[PDB]
Design a binder for this molecule. Structure first.
Ligand code: ZN
Length: 61
DNA sequence: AGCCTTTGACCAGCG
DNA sequence: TCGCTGGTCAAAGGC
């Protein structure tokens, strides 16, 4: 729910590390842009980490 | 209508 | 080999 200035579309969600956390997978909405992030929530909905892969081919919108 | 989640299937690296 | 764990796909539904 927090923002970092980019547009992400969610392409999956999975339970990990023995149903302890749940991980959400997003990729950047800008065309041809291969950047993906994932973010990983605690059982209480609190966000633990955020993982960024790659870089955008466009600047911040 | 055109974006967006959600959800289970699919699949691939690895133990 | 085999089954587990995680990453993605595609089909549906919501706003
Ligand atoms: Zn991008």
């Amino acid at each position: 729910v927090m923002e970092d200035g980019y547009n992400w579309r969610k392409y999956g969600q999975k339970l990990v590390k023995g149903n302890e956390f749940v991980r959400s997978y997003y990729r950047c909405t800008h065309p041809n842009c291969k950047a993906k992030k994932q973010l990983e929530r605690s059982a209480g909905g609190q966000v633990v980490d955020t993982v960024y892969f790659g870089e955008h081919d466009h600047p911040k919108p």
